[model samples]
Every structure is written in structure tokens, then in C-alpha cells.
Target: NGINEELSEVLQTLQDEFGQMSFDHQQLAKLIQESPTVELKDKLECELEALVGRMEAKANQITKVRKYQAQLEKQ
Candidate 1:
């Protein structure tokens, strides 16, 4: 039960962070489209890509956590 509780907490935190990162990515994408300077646009694009990678990783974490929880239940 302790393990399950800790995993749940971690999963919740990751979900919250993932939401924020997704929002940031969207905002960055909008800014990139509207950006006037080529340098600024390139910078924003880089940031957006990094955010995307983090989001993907977090999603995988969530999936794994859920699977682990399911296995625990089966036990």
C-alpha cells in the first residue's frame, strides 16, 4: 500500500507537470508562428521541440505507472 501511495503521488505530480509543459509548448508554437525575427523564431522552435520530448517521456512514464498499478492489483 505504501508503494502504491507513493506511485500515485508521483504520477499525479508528473501529470501536472506534463499539463504545464503542454501548455508551454502550445504557447511557444503560437509565438513561433507570429515571431518576426528569424533568430527568435529559431530559439522558440528549439524550446518547443525540447518540451515535446519531455511531454512524450512523461506520457510513457504515466503509462508504465498505470501498468504497474494494475499488476499490483492482480497480485
Candidate 2:
């Protein structure tokens, strides 16, 4: 039960981080849309891509933790 609580906290933290990252990603997209230089546009695009990747990784971690928690509950 304690472990489940800990995992829940961790999942919540990750989810919060993911939401922040997603917001940043949207902001970057808007910046990219209004960007003046090709170089600057490319740079922001790369950053957005990386941020998306990190968000996906975080989501996967949350899924894994949830699965583990389920298995524990089954036992």
C-alpha cells in the first residue's frame, strides 16, 4: 500500500511535468510559426521535437508504473 502511494505520487509528478512540457511545446510551435529566420525556425523545430520525445518517454514511464501497480494489487 505504501509502495502504491509512492508510485501514485511519482506518476502525478511525471504527469505534471508532461503537461508543462506540452504547454511549452505549443508555445514553441506558435513561435516557430511567427519566426523570421530560417535558422531560428529550424532551431525551434528541433527543440519542439525533443520536447515531444521527452513527453512520450514520460507517458511511457507512467504507463509502466501503472502496470506495475496493477500487478501488485493483483497479488
**Each candidate's lDDT (Cα)?**
0.91, 0.92
Off by over 4 Å in 1: 1-3
lDDT tens string, model 1, 1-75? Answer: 776799899889989998999999989999999988999999888888889999999999989988888898998
Report the CA-based lDDT of candidate 1 relative to the real structure.
0.91
Tens-digit per-residue lDDT, 21-60, candidate 2 = 9999999999999988999999999999999999999999
Cα-based RMSD of candidate 2:
1.7
Candidate 1 local lDDT, residue 55: 96
**Model 1, C-alpha of 30: deviation from truth (Å):** 0.6
| Angstrom error at residue 25, model 2 | 0.6
